[PDB]
Amino acid sequence: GAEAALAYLYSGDAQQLSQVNCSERYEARGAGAMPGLPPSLQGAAGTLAQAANFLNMLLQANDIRESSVEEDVEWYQALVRSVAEGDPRVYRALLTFNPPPGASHLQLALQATRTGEETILQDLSGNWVQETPALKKRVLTNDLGPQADGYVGDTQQVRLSPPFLECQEGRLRPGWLITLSATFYGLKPDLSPEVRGQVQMDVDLQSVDINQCASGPGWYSNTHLCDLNSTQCVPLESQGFVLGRYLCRCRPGFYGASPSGGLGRLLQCLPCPEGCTSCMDATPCLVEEAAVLRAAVLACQACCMLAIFLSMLVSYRCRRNKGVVLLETVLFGFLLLYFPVFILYFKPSVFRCIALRWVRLLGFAIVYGTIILKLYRVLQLFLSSALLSSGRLLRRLGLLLLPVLGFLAVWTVGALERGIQHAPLVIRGHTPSGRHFYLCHHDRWDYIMVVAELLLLCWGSFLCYATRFHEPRYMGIALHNELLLSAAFHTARFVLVPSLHPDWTLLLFFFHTHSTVTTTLALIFIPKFWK
Amino acid sequence: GAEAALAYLYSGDAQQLSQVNCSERYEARGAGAMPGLPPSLQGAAGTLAQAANFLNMLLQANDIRESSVEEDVEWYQALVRSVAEGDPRVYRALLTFNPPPGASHLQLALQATRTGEETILQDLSGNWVQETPALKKRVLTNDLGPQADGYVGDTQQVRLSPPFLECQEGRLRPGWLITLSATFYGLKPDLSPEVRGQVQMDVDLQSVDINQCASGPGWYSNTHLCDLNSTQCVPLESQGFVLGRYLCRCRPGFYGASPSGGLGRLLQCLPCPEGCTSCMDATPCLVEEAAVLRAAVLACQACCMLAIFLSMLVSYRCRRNKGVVLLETVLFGFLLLYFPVFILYFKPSVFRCIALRWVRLLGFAIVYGTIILKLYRVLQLFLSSALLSSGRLLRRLGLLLLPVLGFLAVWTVGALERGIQHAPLVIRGHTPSGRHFYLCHHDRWDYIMVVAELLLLCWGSFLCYATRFHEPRYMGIALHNELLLSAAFHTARFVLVPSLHPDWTLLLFFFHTHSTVTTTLALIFIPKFWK
């Protein structure tokens, strides 16, 4: 059976080799069935070559030796016994003499078997009668112990066979084998060499470990399946003459670890798009950062922060010694509107997100409140009593501030409690382009806020177009332009920034807030500097 | 001679071994004179063990064989001839029989010498009569060709000698050698083994290459001098049995390359303080850079640049439709003073250095000129005619501008021509702390500039203290404070910045210019905003 025998080549069990009959040996058959002569077999071939060289020197020197082999049996018995001790992994030895000219019986056979701590010699002659390779030349001369010529061999002349399982009493013997053979020549009357016999040994090789990942002198040298594009071959060791025993881990480059991470096939470790996107986990890592854009934007913001703080600090005393409260309140409002890009610079936190909303909505309420309070007061005293309002502006500002303050709180209370308790929503972000990040979530209560600040500003637009230089003329351009900018900004933001880079949205926020707040500041405080 | 022989171990020349007499062999003597059995010698030992095993099996089986050796000489002749063909690097073979009980002559000796394509056998018996190692046991049984016991050897029982140079006709033979020996046992009447002789071969080993950097089975395995702290051992190959043939390059870490860069000694590759300070050259590389400080400072400067440009652009039209020229001129002067840190940001160039001087001196001349022109005009009309000067200020500004303009030019012309032609001075810098950089040089003509701007400002200090709110009161604090700051700044700069980091001096320049120019701008334009 050529099936169970092939299954024996992948598992070391010998009981699986039972239940099979034999009529012929089964020789192994693979890519490297015949590799060459490995080193231990060089050591054994050294033993095998010496016997042949001794025999051919003896037979070439004298022509009677080939005859009278019957009474010279002691020497050949000792020779086969010596050959049988050549290696510890030797199973049998055989010495055979070719017959005389035109005969049917081998003149002599002899075999030695290595059964435990013993050697057995049996004739095997008569009742078993079934049957120049670049030979070197030497000159044989003697001084004290004429001159003639001779022929000799060499250890690499030794021949090797594929591996095979011998079969006995019709059943296959467990344990592979390999035979080494050599030939010894005589001398014929024209004095060129001729064959006279052979000497052989069978060597067991089950304990010899196969290395299949690497190369060099073995038997199955390089026949692994793992491709060296995504995987690296790692041979397991401390085993016998067993095939298929190796793994191949995915190298760090294509470390997708799709095919079990490897413990022209078994190479399907997924090509990782990054160092994270499928390697060390089948999910992505955070998106790349920068340190030139971030610090530059932070410094450019801190410029305006220090400038407005300088204005407020310097404007404290140059009216005390003489509307200071309106001026400092509006400057505090602008300071309060210049935070959010600074707030949207560090790592995210629910406190940070709600604080961003806090500062954003309170700043708008306190700055845009004054703009529209002065606008509709003018339209209410133009042609339709607080002539300058001399404090009543502060009263109306508080009336508008307390309500706005509460809205922020309740939603802050409810959303913060539910988020940090059971988290109907959490800080959670992910790009659809193949990245990951953390972000503050958006809500229907954030849609109410936007609509409330957009209708508040539309009422002022109606106030502007009611009357359609002086105070209101500058304010009209600012209010309409900032409506258009804010509407476009929110319409973009609520559907883009889930899928946008953190740096890109930081830049978007920076450009938006700089444009709108700087435009408002310029177009409100320019008339104050020239009059 | 043990001196020329030791010189032969480091050079392959054989003529240096001449002119020396012998009375005894000279054996090699080193750390690894006796390493073990390398693989090719395992192949030869396989040949040598077989002969001994054949002999001991023959002699144990029959007790008459030990006698009648005289007529059995053919077999032993063939045996020594076979042993002499064991290896191509074999020089001689010898088989000896110990004498009978209480004798003085060896019963038989035989030698075979491998002289070219020939083998010579000579008796060497009679006229050369000068003279259980864990032996295994085997059971000898036969089926067709009783039972008895026996003793056998093994290939690792084979003994090896240190290397040595044989000496003949009193002179030392070139070419090292090594002998392999084995013993064959008989059987004594109580039937335990006893010695009966020996079989030997001498093997030449000159062509065997020594690897001295690595380890493993060789002869002089690991005895190199290069330490693995600064150097890595690199053995040269394609040589014979010659010692001392290796180099050891300095590894990239301690790559000082002081000891010839290596082509507990030869380890003095200088420990490089950096990747450059002694490695790849014995001189340093440029000092480390940064991208967070640099961009931040640049952005913080561009803030003020854009602010002052906005002021100038907005102030163009709000007077045209109605001293605008004085205002824009002073603003241009401040813009001209805010350059130098921007100019001291890129790589250095002689054009860049002279341009820095240009902008620095012209800016001071145009801004500080107006300050002192308004100061001494007040002191000249206070109690000691251009009542407001209504253009005469511009006239006096031109009178002061043309002279200053020329000074910059002449020195620019002369210094630039001489520097770029023969370079009495070049862009050349180097820290004393162990770094390198490029810097603009300082000159006596730069000392004249400093003294000229410091005495110009001292005249204004005298103007301030002459009279000792209004215009001069603000200006007095600014002028004295900026004298103190500028004097300290130059006193530091002319002796520090040759040895200071580029980033540190950029920060110094930034803080200095921000403090002085911002203070001047604030204390001059604050009275303009409130009156």
- Identify the three-state secondary structure at position B26: strand
- Identify the three-state secondary structure at position B256: coil
Contact between B180 and B41 (Cβ < 8 Å): yes
Q: Which two tokens stand for residue B175?
A: 């070419």
Chain B interface includes A265 (CB < 8 A): no
Chain B interface includes A68 (CB < 8 A): no
Chain A interface includes B146 (CB < 8 A): no
Q: Are residues B302 and B193 in the same domain?
A: no
Residue B184, beta-bridge partner list: B197
Method: cryo-EM
Q: What resolution (Å)? A: 3.5
Q: Which residues does chain B have within 8 Å of residue A58's beta carbon, measured at their own beta carbons?
A: 74-75, 78
In angstroms, the Cα distances linking B319 to B322, B433, B504 are: 5, 57, 43
- In a domain, residue B129? The reply is no
- In a domain, residue B130? The reply is no
Instruction: Name the one residue in this structure whose structure tokens are 């407001």.
Output: B388
Among residues B314, B518, B296, the alpha carbon closest in space to that of A293 is found at B296
CA atoms of A187 and A148, how far apart (whole Å): 12
CA atoms of B134 and B323, how far apart (whole Å): 119
Among A residues 189-248, those touching chain B with beta carbons less than 8 Å apart: none
Contact between B202 and B178 (Cβ < 8 Å): yes
Q: Which two tokens stand for residue A183?
A: 């030939």
Contact between A242 and A51 (Cβ < 8 Å): no
In angstroms, the Cα distances linking A29 to A5, A36, B195 are: 11, 15, 48
Residue A93, beta-bridge partner list: A112, A201
Rama region for B191: left / alpha / beta (φ>0; ψ in -120 to 50; rest): left
Range of the domain at A521: 292-529
Q: Are residues A347 and A459 in the same domain?
A: yes
Q: Are residues A374 and A241 in the same domain?
A: no
- Identify the three-state secondary structure at position A425: coil
Q: Which two tokens stand for residue B179?
A: 């002998």
Q: Are residues B405 and B464 in the same domain?
A: yes
With CA atoms as reference, the chain A residue closest to B38 would be A39
CA atoms of B233 and B251, how far apart (whole Å): 10
- Length of chain A equals 531
Among residues B434, B414, B433, B432, the alpha carbon closest in space to that of B424 is found at B414
CB spacing of B74 vs A61 below 8 angstroms: yes
CA atoms of A509 and A344, how far apart (whole Å): 9
Q: Are residues B453 and B312 in the same domain?
A: yes
CA atoms of B39 and A264, how far apart (whole Å): 36
CA atoms of B474 and B460, how far apart (whole Å): 14
Where among A204, A228, A248 does a domain terminate?
A204
Residue A427, burial from CB neighbour count under 10 angstroms (0-12, 13-18, 19+): middle
CA atoms of B497 and B490, how far apart (whole Å): 10
Where among A167, A188, A204 does a domain terminate?
A204
Could you tell me which residues come within 8 angstroms of residue B414 by beta carbon, excluding any fewer than 6 positions away?
Answer: none
Q: Are residues B345 and B229 in the same domain?
A: no
A285: DSSP letter: -
Q: Are strands A118-122 and B136-142 parallel, antiparallel or unpaired?
A: parallel
Q: Which two tokens stand for residue B44?
A: 């030869």
Other Cβ atoms closer than 10 A to A143: 11
CB spacing of A145 vs B73 below 8 angstroms: yes
Contact between A66 and A196 (Cβ < 8 Å): yes
Other Cβ atoms closer than 10 A to A34: 11
CA atoms of A408 and A261, how far apart (whole Å): 52
Instruction: Name the one residue in this structure whose structure tokens are 């040298």.
Output: A221
- In a domain, residue B131? The reply is no
Contact between B364 and B337 (Cβ < 8 Å): yes
CA atoms of A305 and A94, how far apart (whole Å): 102
* N- to C-terminal Cα separation, chain B: 112
Where among A186, A204, A222 does a domain terminate?
A204
CA atoms of A211 and A237, how far apart (whole Å): 8
Q: Are residues A308 and A386 in the same domain?
A: yes
Contact between A241 and A209 (Cβ < 8 Å): yes
Among residues B459, B303, B436, B245, the alpha carbon closest in space to that of B371 is found at B459
Instruction: Name the one residue in this structure whose structure tokens are 């057995």.
Output: A120
Number of domains in chain B: 3
Q: Which two tokens stand for residue B221?
A: 């395995």
Q: Are residues B146 and B236 in the same domain?
A: no
A260: DSSP letter: G
Residue B402, burial from CB neighbour count under 10 angstroms (0-12, 13-18, 19+): exposed
CA atoms of A207 and B243, how far apart (whole Å): 39
Q: Are residues A197 and A321 in the same domain?
A: no
Q: Are residues B256 and B298 in the same domain?
A: no
Q: Are residues A167 and A88 in the same domain?
A: yes
Q: Which two tokens stand for residue B151?
A: 């003793």
- In a domain, residue B424? The reply is yes
Instruction: Name the one residue in this structure whose structure tokens are 């029959």.
Output: B62
Q: What is the DSSP string of A343-364?
A: HTTS---HHHHHHHHHHHHHHH
- In a domain, residue B513? The reply is yes
Q: Which two tokens stand for residue A181?
A: 């053979």
- In a domain, residue B161? The reply is yes
- Identify the three-state secondary structure at position A160: strand
Helices A39-61 and B73-84 pack at an angle, to 10 degrees, of: 140
Q: Are residues B214 and B171 in the same domain?
A: no
Q: Which of B58, B119, B142 sits opposite A140 (nearest CB)?
A: B119
φ, ψ of residue A179 to 5 degrees: the values are -105, 140
Q: What is the DSSP string of B88-152?
A: TTEEEEEEEE--STT-SS-SEEEEEE--SSEEEEE---STT-----S-EEEEEEES---EEEEEE
- Identify the three-state secondary structure at position B371: helix
Chain A interface includes B74 (CB < 8 A): yes
